Amino acid sequence: MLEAKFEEASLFKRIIDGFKDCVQLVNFQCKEDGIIAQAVDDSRVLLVSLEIGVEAFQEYRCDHPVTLGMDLTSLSKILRCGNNTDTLTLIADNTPDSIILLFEDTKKDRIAEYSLKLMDIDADFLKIEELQYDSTLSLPSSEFSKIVRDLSQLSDSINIMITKETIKFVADGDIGSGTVIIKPFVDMEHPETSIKLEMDQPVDLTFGAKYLLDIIKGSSLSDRVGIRLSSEAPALFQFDLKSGFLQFFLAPKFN
Amino acid sequence: MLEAKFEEASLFKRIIDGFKDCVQLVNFQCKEDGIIAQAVDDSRVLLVSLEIGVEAFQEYRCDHPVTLGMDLTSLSKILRCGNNTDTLTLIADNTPDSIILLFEDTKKDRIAEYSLKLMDIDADFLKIEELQYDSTLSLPSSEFSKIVRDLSQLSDSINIMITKETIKFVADGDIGSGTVIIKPFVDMEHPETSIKLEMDQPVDLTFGAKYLLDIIKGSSLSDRVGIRLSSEAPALFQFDLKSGFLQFFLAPKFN
Amino acid sequence: MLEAKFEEASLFKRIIDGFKDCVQLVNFQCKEDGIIAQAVDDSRVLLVSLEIGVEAFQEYRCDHPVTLGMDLTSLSKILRCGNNTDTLTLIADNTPDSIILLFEDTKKDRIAEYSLKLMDIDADFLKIEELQYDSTLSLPSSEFSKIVRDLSQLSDSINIMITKETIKFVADGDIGSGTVIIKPFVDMEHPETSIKLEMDQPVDLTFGAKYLLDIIKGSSLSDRVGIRLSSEAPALFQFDLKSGFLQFFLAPKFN
């Protein structure tokens, strides 16, 4: 029997929020040590990998491994019934045909139980993470969110360019252009509003603006965003969770 | 001459709010003791009955009975010009071709007068209320509003099921299901957040979700909603006013 | 070299806000003493004239006259990247093919530079302002905004009628009508919530509601709106700036 209870029903919405705007159906592999889920969009340029440690829950028990794939369109709907902060509990049994989503408020006088029809879905799980990435930077997810949204106003191509201690986001549009140059530093009022950067090799990569706009959905999960870039390999955008994370592997343009 | 002055122009909007989302044109029968209005949607499954006592107004005078039907689409527009809390006064004269809507703010420096073209509309007035209903429950309009909206996410059929001291709202969708079970009790911090229930006979009725979503429009009028259910007859959803009320007679599915 | 720095990037948005909803492309004539810009909609019934004095800026330098026309659709986009209050600086050089828009926040750690492709656009500049207008009134831009929006709910024709110490806005719709009568007076709690009126000759003019709705866009620029009316000539709607203004010349209907 599976019983995964999020303390605050909100974060389960926010994580499937990063999924739904691109990927469609997705296998959630639940095992004793937590949940992992992976999905890839149609064009196979964006790959979303989730990991939820047991410490991210209020309570978690999984007697044995249970893979439960499901339509995020249908799931999200049940997550609309979820008014935020209602101890959402995922419940399933051995070889289940359905998953139960159970909400509960502070006052016991209200409790709602929902059920979601599951799917049989093959999935060739991927493991494309590199050992080392040419560059690695950390910045506020709100800042990165802004940069993407603003430069997205122009052409549908944003070009990240990293030289030593210099990160440069550029969009060159048909109507005009825009460039945001930020630099690594250290804050103290809130050290987690600062910018970090480790550069083994400089990078000059272009990404589809459409997808960068979808990657920043996860900015509601963490204060920071972890971007790892490689010239030959897809970029790793990561939003860290209390235990585990939400990753977005994006392939840069060929050009 | 007719002169019906609502103290706060808002509530006249809110009551025609319950109408407009379904019914079209509607005769407002004005007489010495107040206003009554009745309308039925196209499919004749929803009937909306209004009653406004004189105490619901700031001032009210109707020298003799005057029936004034009017298009709610056109009326609502004039009620958009009404910025909330502006002593809305309905004015008409003997055998009138038009009704005058008169707004006024705290500061005399602003006063707006509007006129609405009336209609000649036959209406076979209905009186389908039963003497006794198999079950009768009272709950917060906000709670009932939530239950409908959430279960409406699934299939377009919500099934209310009442056994002794057990009210059960269920929606069984193609993608999944949902069930909210509430029970009668008594609160004291706010006794009008509690749940009441008188059960002469148990009921198992299904209603079109579309209409239940329209019935909960009136939740802006009262803290509570009065639901009376009968197996053979249409259900009575009622939002009580200071004097008078707003009722929704809904026919359950045949199944 | 041109360097026009608005203290608060917001007001440059708000002024092109009055333009964009009607006019398309527009020459911004920049010279030593400030900026002027003029544009006319397709039907040639609305003419928008802008003037920005040097005192409206934080800093301003224009070594010599430079006319820079540009698409407001494209400009507005770059002004979306502008988060309010970011010292927007317009930068250009001799005979420029592009204009640079430069944002900057309180904290130096963020600075964004954008570029907008300019256009070659002929413009026969107009000077249709009369010496004297039959009537001239001043009222709160918020009040005038309300009157237009409300009476716009009815027919697409609003008729302003001014007799001595009596301003009367009337819309006579197919469904119904509405009339707002205001009078000149003097306040003291806030003397700039009052109503002024100088009447040399009475006027009875009708204006297209579509355009009056576009003229009130500028209500975000000033507390008051200056309306000058003439029977034979187009009306002058003006929102005063710290230095300079934003004018809307509207031609009344022939009828």
Author numbering:
A (entry chain A), B (entry chain A), C (entry chain A): 1 to 255
Article, verbatim:
Proliferating cell nuclear antigen (PCNA) is a protein that is essential for many DNA metabolic processes including DNA replication, base excision repair, nucleotide excision repair, mismatch repair, and recombination.
We first measured the growth rate of these 17 strains in liquid media. Twelve of these strains (A112G, Y114F, S115E, S115G, S115V, S177G, S177L, S177V, G178L, G178M, S178T, and V180A) had slower growth rates than the wild type strain of approximately 4 to 5 hours. We then examined the rates of spontaneous mutagenesis and the rates of UV-induced mutagenesis of these 17 strains as well as E113G and G178S. Five of these strains (S115N, S177V, S179R, S179T, and I181R) had complete defects in UV-induced mutagenesis similar to that observed with the K164R control strain.
